[model samples]
Target: EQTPLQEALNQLMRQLQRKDPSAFFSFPVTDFIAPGYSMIIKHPMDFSTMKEKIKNNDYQSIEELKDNFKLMCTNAMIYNKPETIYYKAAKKLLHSGMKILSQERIQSLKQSIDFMA
Candidate 1:
């Protein structure tokens, strides 16, 4: 039986195959870009809070947003082994991006709508 995490990974893989022209998944484990890009692929946990935030369109508590953003890098490292160069490069890139974001050198914006809203 596949765990929810496994199912999520599978779905993410399929989506990457369908969407990324880079064909990132087929690349060798040593290829930096493959996992570098994959690290940004959002998972179910990343969207749980955003679902409500989108409808509200209010970011008064926007500082909370950083938590979810960090999950991408955290999940990447947690899910992929560090001995793999691809994972290392990806984690490094993500760590750098997070630092920039945390330092206010970068910003994240999103738009979403609920038909029912």
Candidate 2:
């Protein structure tokens, strides 16, 4: 189910997943886990959705996948209070994830992302 493109995507996703030791961003947020979550979060993105998208080749390019990673973290920050652990974790994850995506080794990637724009 993985082409070389998706294989690379999987590698990046795993690195981002490592940032969340608590697995808070592993799956979709639900009302059962956080009350009124659906009402508060208009856009939801998570690791599982990323995985599925990769498997289906849903992403047009690497930058597209990176956007989803950002969206996932953004959703958590928006739904949780600024003082809460989830907010802090999302902020840290966003930094780490962006670093991984923007590494100097991946200059070709940055060019490809430029291609997207």
Report backbone clashes per prediction. Answer: 0, 0
Q: Write the per-residue lDDT of candidate 1 for residues 1-117, one digit (tens) a residue.
A: 543333333333343234323332233233263345445444523332443343454333334444544554465566567897546755665555455445332132211112212
Error (Å) of candidate 2 at residue 93 is: 0.5
TM-score against truth, every candidate: 0.37, 0.87
lDDT of each: 0.41, 0.85
| Tens digits of lDDT, candidate 2, 1-117 | 456667778888889899888998988888998999999888888899999999998987788888899999999888899999999999999999999898563666556655655
lDDT of 2: 0.85
TM-score of 2: 0.87
Instruction: Flag regions of model 1 displaced more than 4 Å.
Output: 1-60, 104-117
Best by TM-score: 2
RMSD of each: 12.6, 3.6
